Amino acid sequence: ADRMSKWTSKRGPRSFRGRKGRGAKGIGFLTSGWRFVQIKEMVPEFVVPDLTGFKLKPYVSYLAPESEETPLTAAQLFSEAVAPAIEKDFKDGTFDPDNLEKYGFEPTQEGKLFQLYPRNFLR
Amino acid sequence: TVIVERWWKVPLAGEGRKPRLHRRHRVYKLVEDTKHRPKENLELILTQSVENVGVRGDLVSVKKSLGRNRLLPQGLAVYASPENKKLFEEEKLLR
Amino acid sequence: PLHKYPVWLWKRLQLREGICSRLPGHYLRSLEEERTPTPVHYRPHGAKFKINPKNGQRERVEDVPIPIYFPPESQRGLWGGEGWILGQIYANNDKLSKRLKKVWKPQLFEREFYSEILDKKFTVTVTMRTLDLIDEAYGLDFYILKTPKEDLCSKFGMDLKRGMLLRLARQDPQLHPEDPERRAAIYDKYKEFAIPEEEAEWVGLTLEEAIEKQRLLEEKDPVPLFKIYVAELIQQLQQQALS
Amino acid sequence: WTCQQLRNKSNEDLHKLWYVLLKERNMLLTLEQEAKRQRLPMPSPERLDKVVDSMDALDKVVQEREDALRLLQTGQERARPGAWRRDIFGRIIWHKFKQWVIPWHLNKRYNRKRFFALPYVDHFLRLEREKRARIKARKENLERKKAKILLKKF
Amino acid sequence: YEWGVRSTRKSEPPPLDRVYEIPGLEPITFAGKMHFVPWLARPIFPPWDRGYKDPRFYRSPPLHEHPLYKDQACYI
RNA sequence: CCUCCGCAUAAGCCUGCGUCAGAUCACUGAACUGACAAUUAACAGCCCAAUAUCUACAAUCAACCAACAAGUCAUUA
RNA sequence: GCUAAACCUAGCCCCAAACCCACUCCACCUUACUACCACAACCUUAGCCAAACCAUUUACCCAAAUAAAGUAUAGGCGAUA
Ligand SMILES: [Mg+2]
Ligand SMILES: [Mg+2]
Ligand SMILES: [Mg+2]
Ligand SMILES: [Mg+2]
């Protein structure tokens, strides 16, 4: 006879308490006789770098001078990545409206391991 | 079809007003049922020498039954429209 | 408080800002028009005025239609405009007797038709009225093409109309691919109904259907910004070169 | 760390800095809890806030890079696909998609959902709107009234 | 007397929308917005094949299609 | 001196007499307030590739006998 | 002398004007707020009440304020409309 409390896996009868969980992402499946099969590949792997000889530390010196905040946009990214290559190739006759893929553009995301839309990677 | 009239008169609305109706205005009186009115013939022109109705180019009045169910489906006859009527006069005049 | 616009206007008012705004003009005009159907279940008053036998004074009259209910099965056929009449009656045609609920339903018949333009055999549920109108119009095609939306009273009637008008517009060769001259004859028979193609697209369409169609046309995969910036950059470079 | 400072930093280096910030956070979080247990004040509690902010900043910086690149490649503003839909309560929602193995027409659970409003809902939409209007009208009035008393006092 | 009563069997699918019959045009269906609505027409979907093999979700060949199928009946 | 009660599971409830500090039929305290702790899976829940195909003979110590109301439990390619 | 008493401002009401919000990440129609597998919507309002009972009947928003006019008209020609 309570409506206002949050509904949880603690709360039902036996069957109910089995079915619901907390938020944890499942990492396998079940087979006959309730045997759990784990898939190694479904388990997230921590991609953790080498920290040896690394100068950056978690806090910053106050002695550092202040600079104006300017966020990143597509326009300026194009200007400081693609634009110099394009204009340099515009000077000669190497540039082409077709096959501009040389500059880093891709027609499709289908083949890629890291597909941008829809996103297929974690963080 | 069924044709009805109201028991109660409806007050006038004027030109640009939709009439105001009441629970009383829903009461109807049966005028006539269309299905009970006597039979009428359908005018046709025959394209073929069909049995006991006539021959090609004849203007014939026949029952709606025979017309819609025998004559028109099989293309034995055509509608006696003004457009095709004149056409059948033309082919006759060619003689 | 008060709403700015009366509530009855909202249906109209909403057509002006969304997806309905960018719908074609001709479709919106066909949606707007409010013309009355022809009488089916009531004998209309002949004249605008009539003398009262009561007092001998000439009085104005109006034609007030009976409200007609159309069950959804009616959309899957061609009823000439006959619907269910739901009303009340007095028991023995005396007002002093008991009042009772009455429903008058039309008689229905399953009948076979051939459409010349569509070159297709159909089997539809119809009334005697419809059969009579077809006879007077001198064929199914003529009946479908002549009769406005209101009088047809059928989604399926409108769909037949849409097809036929599209076929006339396109001068479709698949009417008779093997027999070209017969195709020519069938076209010139129904030449007076012929309208433009892009207008014929939208005939006999409900608003929900319309907005699906419009949404389908306007929806596009968005252009990568790589193309935009590369186009404009070579433009700036073009003007730079011509200096 | 400032967002600007982190933007100057390399892509790979941000990834490395981010674990440096991770370990630092956990230390301070365990230190928070131990103070709480001993019923003692924390040594420098504000450190935690700083650390958190730095990582917020870092995440934002990285996010920006991904977002930028998406625009240049696909022209999509949102990473995850979705649609404007109409729930049964007749209100307009941004429905986010999920991933499935099978196509939608074959999905029994998905087809159970109603992404449309039947007509009975329209009256409620009216009442809801009216309610919103009332609240708004009330707000406006109070604004004006308050200015009035503020004029008589000054 | 046939076995299995009518109610128990899988229901015969509802009759097709009349728009589909008319040879001139293609219907407007709710294929476009990826959910059912009552007012647009029911789309007809092409039969689906999972491109890759998945052991848990496997459908066996029809009986003629098996390599070991023989007209002569063995009794085991 | 009493015990037809107890211990456990289920069903229901949701931290509801653990520790520490203030605080208030009965302690100036506790089944009050605040802060801190805790309940670790082997028990239990959460299952199963497909298409055909198989499945006449109760239970009762299942033996003898005895019935009637005619019965909870199987596969093979 | 206790118990008390006293307070002005949160806000709200009716107008006018003007056509409104639908919203970081995650989740949410299965037992909602739960990552992850082969049916479908449209269908006369009734009644209290008035008639000093009650049985035909009994005002209810439809798109310009005023006036025409409680007029023509309707009605167990009555209540009333
Ligand atoms: Mg007037
Ligand atoms: Mg176990
Ligand atoms: Mg009375
Ligand atoms: Mg009284």
E strands present in chain A: 28-31, 35-38
Q: Distance of CA B76 to CAs B41, B49, B51, Å? A: 17, 8, 11
- Residues belonging to chain C with any Cβ–Cβ distance to chain D shorter than 8 Å: 1, 7, 222-226, 229
Distance C5 CA to F5 C1' (A): 78
Q: Distance of CA E54 to CAs A37, D101, D107, E47, E51, Å? A: 15, 11, 18, 18, 10
Nucleotide nearest to B12 (CA to C1'): G73
Provide long-range contacts, Cβ within 8 A and 24+ apart, for C166-170. Answer: C166/C197, C166/C200, C166/C201, C166/E24, C166/E25, C167/C117, C167/C118, C167/E24, C168/C117, C168/C193, C168/C194, C168/C195, C168/C200, C169/C194, C169/C195, C169/C196, C169/C197, C169/C200, C170/C197
Distance A62 CA to G14 C1' (A): 61
**Nearest neighbour of C99 by CB, restricted to B1, B27, B67:** B27
Nearest to C197 by CA among C22, C26, C63, C9: C26
**At how many degrees (to 10) do helices C225-241 and D46-73 cross?**
70
Resolution expressed in Å: 3.1
- Chain C contact for A75, CB < 8 A? yes
Task: Mutate one of D71, D85, D125 to test the C interface: name it (highest C CB count within 10 A).
Answer: D71
Contact: E35, D106; criterion CB under 8 Å: no
Please, how many CA atoms are within 13 Å of residue B37, restricted to the half-sphere of its CB? 9
Q: Is the CB of A20 under 7 A from strand F?
A: no
**Residues of A in Cβ contact (< 8 Å) with C224:** 105
As a whole number of angstroms, the distance between CA C210 and CA C204 comes to 10
Give me the number of domains chain C comprises. Answer: 1
The residue of chain B with its CA nearest to that of C91 is B29
Q: Which of residues 3-62 of E touch D (CB under 8 A)?
A: 33-38, 45, 48, 50
Distance A16 CA to F44 C1' (A): 12
**Helix segments in B1-95, DSSP class H:** 64-66, 72-74, 82-93
Distance E34 CA to F46 C1' (A): 32
Nearest to C145 by CA among C104, C102, C190: C190
Kindly give the distance from the C-alpha atom of residue B26 to the centroid of ligand 3, in angstroms, as a whole number: 24
Given strand B77-79, what is the order of strands in its sheet?
B59-63, B41-46, B77-79
Q: Distance of CA A104 to CAs B18, C121, C226, D72, Å? A: 68, 59, 9, 10
**Residues of D in Cβ contact (< 8 Å) with C229:** 72
**At how many degrees (to 10) do helices C225-241 and A83-91 cross?**
40
Contact: A74, C225; criterion CB under 8 Å: yes
Report yes or no: C152 and C201 within 8 Å, Cβ to Cβ.
no
Q: Distance of CA C199 to CAs C28, C154, C172, Å? A: 12, 20, 16
Can you give the C-alpha Rg of chain E in angstroms?
Answer: 21
Judged by 3 or more CB pairs under 8 A, whether E touches B is no
Looking up tokens 């269910």 gives: C84
Distance C102 CA to G45 C1' (A): 15
Q: Is the CB of A2 under 7 A from strand F?
A: yes
DSSP helix/strand/coil, B22: coil
Q: What are phi and psi of C226, to 5 degrees?
A: -60, -45
Nucleotide nearest to A30 (CA to C1'): F47
- Residue A82 sits at the vertex; the CA angle it makes with A80 and A85, to the nearest 5 degrees, is 105
**At how many degrees (to 10) do helices D11-38 and D46-73 cross?**
150
- Tell me the one-letter amino acid at D28: L
As a whole number of angstroms, the distance between CA E30 and CA C203 comes to 19
Nearest to B73 by CA among C205, C134, A5: C134
Nearest bound ligand to the CA of residue A33: 2
Domain that holds residue C224: 1-243
As a whole number of angstroms, the distance between CA D38 and CA A105 comes to 58
- Enter the DSSP assignment of E39: S
User: A58: which residues sit within 8 A by CB, 6+ positions away?
Assistant: D17, D20, D21, D24, D51, D54
3-state helix/strand/coil string of chain C: CCCCCCHHHHHHHHHHCCCCCCCCHHHHHHHHCCCCCCCCCCCCCCCCEEECCCCCCEEECCCCCCCCECCHHHHHCECCCCCEEEEEEECCCCCCCCEEEEEECCCCEEEEEEECCCCEEEEEEECHHHHHHHHHHCCHHHHHHHCCHHHHCCHHHHHHHHHHHHHHHHCCCCCCCCCHHHHHHHHHHCHHHCCCHHHHCCCCCCHHHHHHHHHHHHCCCCCCHHHHHHHHHHHHHHHHHCC
As a whole number of angstroms, the distance between CA D15 and CA D10 comes to 9
- Tell me the one-letter amino acid at B90: E
Can you give the C-alpha Rg of chain D in angstroms?
Answer: 26
Q: Is the CB of C11 under 7 A from strand G?
A: no
Report yes or no: E34 and E10 within 8 Å, Cβ to Cβ.
no
Q: Is the CB of D41 under 7 A from strand F?
A: no
**What is the per-residue burial (b if ≥16 Cβ within 10 Å, else e) of D70-104?**
bbbbbbbeeeeeeeebbeeebeeeebeeeeeeeee
Burial of B71 (0-12, 13-18, 19+ CB in 10 A): buried
Contact: C106, B4; criterion CB under 8 Å: no
* Closest residue to G60 (CA, C1′): B22
**Nearest neighbour of A75 by CB, restricted to C227, C229, C234:** C229
Q: Is the CB of C47 under 7 A from strand G?
A: no
- Tell me the one-letter amino acid at B47: T
Q: Which of residues 214-233 of C touch A (CB under 8 A)?
A: 224-227, 229-230, 233
CATH of the domain at B81: 3.40.5.10
Report yes or no: C230 and E46 within 8 Å, Cβ to Cβ.
no
Contact: C131, B29; criterion CB under 8 Å: no
Looking up tokens 């691919």 gives: C177
As a whole number of angstroms, the distance between CA C82 and CA C228 comes to 59
Nearest bound ligand to the CA of residue B15: 1
Looking up tokens 């080498």 gives: A50
Q: Distance of CA A51 to CAs A56, C137, D15, D63, Å? A: 10, 90, 11, 23
Which technique was used to obtain these atomic coordinates? Answer: cryo-EM
* The two structure tokens encoding residue D104: 């939608």
As a whole number of angstroms, the distance between CA E8 and CA E70 comes to 34
Domain that holds residue B52: 42-95
DSSP helix/strand/coil, D38: helix
As a whole number of angstroms, the distance between CA C18 and CA B43 comes to 53
As a whole number of angstroms, the distance between CA D106 and CA E50 comes to 12
Looking up tokens 């099965």 gives: C73
